[PDB]
Each structure stands twice: as C-alpha cells, then as structure tokens.
C-alpha cells in the first residue's frame, strides 16, 4: 500500500544521491586552487542613511542603481537617493509589521508585506503627486517573507504557509501557486531572465521553481538549519544560500549538487542576507555578529570584514552597476559601502 | 554647490525627514502589548472586555494612552522566526485558564509556554502581565475535583484562596531573570473595569522603569 510508495520514494532518493555522487568529480576548491587570491579588500563606508526609527527588515535597490527602498517596523518604507542621502518618498503602511520590500524594475511600483498576510502594492508615478495603494494582494494565509517584482503586472511572493505564489497585479488573484515546501519559506531570488526562481525554507532545502508552469525542478539539500537568504549568481546558473548554521553554500543549477561551503570557526551566528558582485568573484554575507563578511566566492577565504553596524545586519543589496553595496541592520541605519 | 532643483529636493527630503520625527514620537508615547497563551485560554473574552488576518490589532484609549494591542494567535507559523519583531514591546499580556488544569493537563502546556516565552533572548527586560482566567468555574471545579491530579508534587488545602495563591507562586518562579523583569499577576474580575485598570497600572510601571533606565536613574 502506502509502504510500497514510501519505499519507492526512498529508493528514488537513494538513486538520486548516487547519481549526484557520480557526477561529483572535483570540488570548486580543487579547480580554483591555482587562481590568485583577491587579496585583502578594504571597503569604507561612503554614505549613511539615517531617518528610520526602528529595526529595519528590508531594502531593495532600483534598476538605475541610485534609488533604494527600505522598510522598517515604524510603519514606514522610505525610498532613498543614494548619491545625496535624500528621502524622496515616505509611504505609511497599514500594518507596521513589514518583513520584505520590493522595487519594480521599471521603478513605478513598490511592494511590502509581513505578518498581515498582504503584499501591498504602491503606485509611485501618480498624477496626483502622492503614493497610493494600487492593489492589496490578500489570501495567502501566512506572514510574507519576500515579495519580488517580475514586471509591472506580476509579482512573486513567499509566505510562512510553506507556499510561494505568482500573483497578477491588476486582477489581484494569484496566477500560479507553488507548493512542495514542508517548512516556512523565508527567502526568494529571481533569475536575471525572470524565468526561474529559488526559495529557501526551514527544511534546510532550496527549491528551484519554474514560473511558466509551477513545477519544482531541483531541490538542494545539505544545510543543517533553516534558510534565511537566497541570491543567484549573476550568470544565473548558480545561487548562494545563507542559513543559521553559520555557513553560506554555493549551489549549481546544472550540476544539481552543493559546490562549496563558506565557514569559519570564529563565526557561530546565523546569516541573515547574502548577495553577489557584478563579476560574482566575491559575495557579501550579513551575519548576526553585527558585521558583514566578504567571502571570496572562488576560494572560500574571508576577503574582508564590513564591521560598521551596532546590531544584526538584517539585509544587504548590491547595485545593478556593481558600484556599491548598501547594508541595513537593526539599529535603523543604512550604510553604503564602496 | 547645489542647483535650483537640488535645493528644493533637499527641502522636500527635510520635510519628509521632519514628519518622521513626529510620527516616531507618537509611536514611542503609545503603549504596545502582546497576547499569548494556549487555545481557548480566554484571549477572546479579555479582548472583548478591554475593547469596550495574521495580526488582530486592537486599539483602545484609556486614561490618555493609545494602548496598541496585538493578537497574534490567529496565524500559525514558526513562532521563533517572527518573535523578534515584537522585541521592544512594553509588556506581554499572558492569559492562563485556571480551570483547564485537568483537561488534556493543559496547565502543563500553559506553564511550558510561559517558560518558553519568559526566557526568550528578546523578552529579557519586557515585563509580563499575567492573567488567570475563569476563576469562577475554577472554584467549583476544585470543590469537586482534587488539585493533586494536575500537581502530583503538592500537599495542601483544596480551598480557592490557597490553591490560587499556590498557582500564582508556582507561575511566578518560571522566569530566571527575576532582577530585570517583573511579572504582574492578576485574577480577572468578571465584567468589571478592574482588568483594564490593572493593565494600565502595569504598563505605567513598565513605562516609569523604562524612563528611569533611559535617564540612567535606575
């Protein structure tokens, strides 16, 4: 009966692991052990955006790499001018419990959500001058984790109900619902072509979804704790993964197996956010040690420490231009490093 | 140097970063609270008494205090992964059912939940307002059924006052940081205003202590 199906699933998992082992021939360290180290990198803060009055939880850059939106628990999300440290907008929120924010690639819309189960959409290019709530996407029965825009008419959201859902802005109803996670989804990253996305949950697993039909292509396991952050490689063929095991892991879409783990005996705290650089040579991870560690993404060497925060670094993002990285922490401060 | 438009832009970004100051001042002055407890432990009755989908926010002005309130039990998810959002709350209103000590036992789950909540890293300095509910039915329930079933390691009279005092003393020692935080325990007074009055008194105590610590007078 169901025992036969369970045994079939077990043997399928065993043969999948055997196939993954067979394709495993040389780790990334062995391939890149001949490369020159990036060397000690010193990145000094250039701007400090102040004005938030509570522990911030979200930040997102614009496609022009000058405007970034950040959300905090004071019920406000602010779009900043990075060059001049100017607050262009301050949008009040119906619910102060915000855990994510998004900036539309066109720049016309922003999204925010949290414990209220609603990924609100705000209209910036309005003839009336003020920012209005375009649509409130409700009906997802769980705290939202990562709203991300596909276009001006679509959005991808992740909640604590173990389901990711692709929505439609103008109709207000979700086009596709992604199911398969057995733990609370907490992270989401979009591929550069917006054709695939990967999410991490409490199951210590990152699942590669497909926007077109919704089936889950590949499931990546190997973490020993929940996943708090996900980010693709710029090439789009790989993605990093931050967890509470104090280990960032780099995964491969094509090889479908873990590639390299980033660990140091000194750090024993979780990882709240990860990112990459334009070339993908180094990736920045925001720990709870009140500092951000820059890891050489090809040698697993700590290249430098971005220690400038007095509390846990909630999130960090790297511009599309690759010129600077902005980190946000629970002390209600945004630091643009360069 | 700045152009004609950049001066207007910084004036805009200075009025925006002027309204934020008043917004934060309003947010700090008001009082925030949490609701926690087991299922059907009396959250609905206290909420409806004090009033007169993930977060059931409640507002009620009493003695010139906004008294923002959050009922979080509506949404079921990893408690440990959003419990840090409520760090910095003024106090946690914890509802305990006195008469649920024998059904499946639930007093053991209530005390376990209280121990888990009071010993969180985030809820170190946040005082906990403790409510003991449905004492009226509790009186007759202990008149009929002995208390030793819930508490095997007990020896004492089976009267209402002594049993309630022992339950209060047992619950008040769960916390280990007795020096930093203080638990305010209360028995709900049926349909009187005394419950809201006690909540106001406890939050006033917490605010006074927090203000002293901010001034360094502590």
């Amino acid at each position: 009966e169901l025992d036969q199906l369970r045994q079939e699933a077990e043997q399928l998992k065993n043969q999948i692991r055997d196939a993954r082992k067979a394709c495993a021939d040389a780790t990334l360290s062995q391939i890149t052990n001949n490369i020159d180290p990036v060397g000690r990198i010193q990145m000094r803060t250039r701007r400090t955006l102040r004005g938030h009055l509570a522990k911030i939880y979200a930040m997102h850059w614009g496609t022009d790499s000058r405007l970034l939106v950040s959300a905090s628990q004071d019920g406000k999300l602010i779009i900043w001018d990075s060059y001049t440290t100017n607050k262009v907008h301050a949008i009040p929120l119906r619910s102060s419990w915000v855990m994510t924010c998004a900036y539309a690639p066109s720049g016309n819309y922003v999204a925010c959500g949290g414990l209220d189960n609603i990924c609100s959409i705000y209209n910036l290019k309005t003839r009336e001058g003020n920012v209005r709530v375009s649509r409130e996407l409700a009906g997802h029965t769980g705290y939202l984790s990562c709203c991300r825009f596909l276009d001006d008419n679509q959005i991808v959201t992740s909640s604590g109900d173990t389901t990711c859902a692709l929505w439609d802005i103008e109709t207000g109803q979700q086009t596709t619902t992604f199911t398969g996670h057995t733990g609370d989804v907490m992270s989401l990253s979009l591929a550069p072509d917006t054709r695939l996305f990967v999410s991490g949950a409490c199951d210590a697993s990152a699942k590669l979804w497909d926007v077109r039909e919704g089936m889950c292509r590949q499931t990546f396991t190997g973490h020993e704790s929940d996943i708090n952050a996900i980010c693709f490689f710029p090439n789009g063929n790989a993605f990093a993964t931050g967890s509470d095991d104090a280990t960032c892991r780099l995964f491969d879409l094509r090889a479908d197996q873990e590639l390299m783990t980033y660990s140091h005996d000194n750090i024993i705290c979780g990882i709240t956010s990860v990112s990459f650089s334009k070339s993908g040579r180094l990736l920045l991870a925001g720990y709870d040690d009140f500092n951000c560690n820059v890891w050489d993404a090809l040698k697993a060497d700590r290249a430098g420490v971005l220690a400038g925060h007095d509390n846990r670094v909630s999130c960090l993002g790297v511009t599309d231009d690759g010129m600077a990285v902005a980190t946000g922490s629970w002390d209600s401060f945004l630091k643009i490093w360069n | 140097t700045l152009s004609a438009e950049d001066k207007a832009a910084v004036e805009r970004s200075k009025m925006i970063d002027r309204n934020l100051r008043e917004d934060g001042e309003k947010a700090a002055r008001e009082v925030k609270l949490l609701l926690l407890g087991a299922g059907e432990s009396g959250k609905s009755t206290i909420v409806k008494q004090m009033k007169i989908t993930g977060i059931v926010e409640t507002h009620f002005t009493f003695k010139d205090l906004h008294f923002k309130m959050f009922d979080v039990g509506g949404q079921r998810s990893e408690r440990k992964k959003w419990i840090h959002c409520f760090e910095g709350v003024t106090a946690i209103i914890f509802c305990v059912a006195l008469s649920d000590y024998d059904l499946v036992n639930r007093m053991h789950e209530s005390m376990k939940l209280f121990d888990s909540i009071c010993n969180n890293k985030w809820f170190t300095d946040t005082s906990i307002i403790l409510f003991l509910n449905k004492k009226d039915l509790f009186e007759e329930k202990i008149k009929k059924s002995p208390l030793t079933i819930c508490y095997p390691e007990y020896a004492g009279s089976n009267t209402y006052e002594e049993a309630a005092a022992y339950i209060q003393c047992q619950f008040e020692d769960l916390n280990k940081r007795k020096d930093t935080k203080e638990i305010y325990t209360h028995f709900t007074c049926a349909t009187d205003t005394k419950n809201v009055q006690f909540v106001f008194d406890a939050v006033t105590d917490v605010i006074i202590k927090n203000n002293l610590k901010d001034c360094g007078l502590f």
Epitope: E128 | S3, M15
Partner: single-chain antibody
Framework: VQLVESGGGLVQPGGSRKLSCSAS????????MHWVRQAPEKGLEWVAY????????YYADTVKGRFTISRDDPKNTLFLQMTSLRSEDTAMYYC??????????????WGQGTTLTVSSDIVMTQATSSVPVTPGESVSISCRSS???????????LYWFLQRPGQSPQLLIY???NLASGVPDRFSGSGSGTAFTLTISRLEAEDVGVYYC?????????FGAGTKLEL
C-alpha cells in the same frame, strides 16, 4: 488635476488686487506653486515661486517687494497679493504646479489664467521667431542660453513648453531629454550647453502653436521669446 484661478479684471494703476487659485484633484500640500504671467502679445514671464510648506519664496526682480505670494494648504488655495499695479503688469497670469525630487517633472500642469487689465540672470534667445510648417514635416526649433546649462551633477535644466492657440501651455520635455507624461513620443530634445534643439517627427494637427524654452538652473526663471508655428 484641476488648477483654476480667479480674481482678474479691470483695475486702476497703483491699486491692489488679490489673485486666488483653486487647486483640486492632487496633493496641493506637497506641490510647489508658481505664478507665470504672459503679456497680451509678448512671451511668458516668471513672477514668483513658493515651495512646499512655504519654506522658500522667490520673486522676479520686476515684481519684488510689490508682489507677495501665500498658499493655503488645508483649503487647497494659492494667493498672489499685488500692490501698486503698474501699466506693464497687464498680462495673463497662469498658475503652475511643480514637484521637486529625483526624477520628478516640474511645471507639469498649468492653470487657465486670470485676465488682469491695468489702464546677473540667464537670458534666453530663440533664433527664429516664426517657422512655417506643413503636415508630415519635421522641424527642429533652436534655443540658446547665455550660460551653459549643464550643472556639475549632470542635470541640464531646460524645459520645452507648447502654447496652443487660446489654451494653456503644456510641458513637453523637461531637462532636455525626458518627455512629460501624456505627451506623444513624436517630440525629442537634445543639444549641449547653450545650444538646444527640439525635433518633432511627423507633426500633425493640434500641434501648431508657440514653443518656449525654459532654464531652471537658477532664479529668476527666464523664457525664450517664443517660436511661433503656422501652416
């Protein structure tokens, strides 16, 4: 949006008049108001500017001291108190809204205008004051400035306006490159410091009028003479 102004009419020289503008359909409290007159036969001319929150107020030198401007945020009304009106003060007083932030489009919407009848700086010159045109043609209007308008940050402060016959001006291109909202993509602006061009592709009806070029580099604000188009 709706900007309507009233209070114009005949007045004897040296008297006082109180122009008022009623603003509806937009967040008046956030927008900075302008007053722009236009002589019965001459071009447009900037008058005064009040910022959001009535913080910074600027006046043209020709009306400094004599004219004061105030705004009423909760009632959504803008005033322009005028004292000691002179003969040259007879003009078409337009009301213009302008929002100033990164990526905004100032001078986007214009009012109707009150009829008032009384019985150092960057100078703008437009090379040609009249260009005959025909349907389907493509003309390039040229406008020059005394000083190069390319600021250090990289924003070149130019504005192109279009005066329909017997109507209100409409913003076409702001900062020489960015098209205003609701404007067809036919128009195109380009150029460099002190040399500006406006390329119109496949111009059609409801497009003939007078085109003005504006500088926003520094106050006072000045316009070109006005290139007038006929069929």
């Amino acid at each position: 949006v709706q900007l309507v102004e009233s209070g114009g009419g005949l007045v004897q020289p040296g008297g006082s008049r109180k122009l008022s503008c009623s603003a509806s359909g937009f967040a008046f409290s956030s927008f900075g108001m302008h007053w722009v007159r236009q002589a019965p036969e001459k071009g447009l001319e900037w008058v005064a500017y009040i910022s959001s929150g009535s913080g910074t107020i600027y006046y043209a030198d020709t009306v400094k001291g004599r004219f004061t401007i105030s705004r009423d945020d909760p009632k959504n009304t803008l005033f322009l108190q005028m004292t000691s009106l002179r003969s040259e003060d007879t003009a078409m007083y337009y009301c213009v809204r302008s929002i100033y932030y990164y990526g905004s489009s100032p001078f986007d919407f214009w009012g109707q205008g009150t009829t008032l009848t009384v019985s150092s700086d960057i100078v703008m010159t437009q090379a040609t004051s009249s260009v005959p045109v025909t349907p389907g043609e493509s003309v390039s209007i040229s406008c020059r400035s005394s000083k190069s308008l390319l600021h250090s940050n990289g924003n070149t402060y130019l504005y192109w306006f279009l005066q329909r016959p017997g109507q209100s001006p409409q913003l076409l291109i702001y900062r020489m490159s960015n098209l205003a909202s609701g404007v067809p993509d036919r128009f195109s602006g380009s150029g460099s410091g002190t040399a500006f061009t406006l390329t119109i592709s496949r111009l059609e009806a409801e497009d003939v009028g007078v085109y003005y070029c504006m500088q926003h580099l520094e106050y006072p604000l000045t316009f070109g003479a006005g290139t007038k188009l006929e069929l």
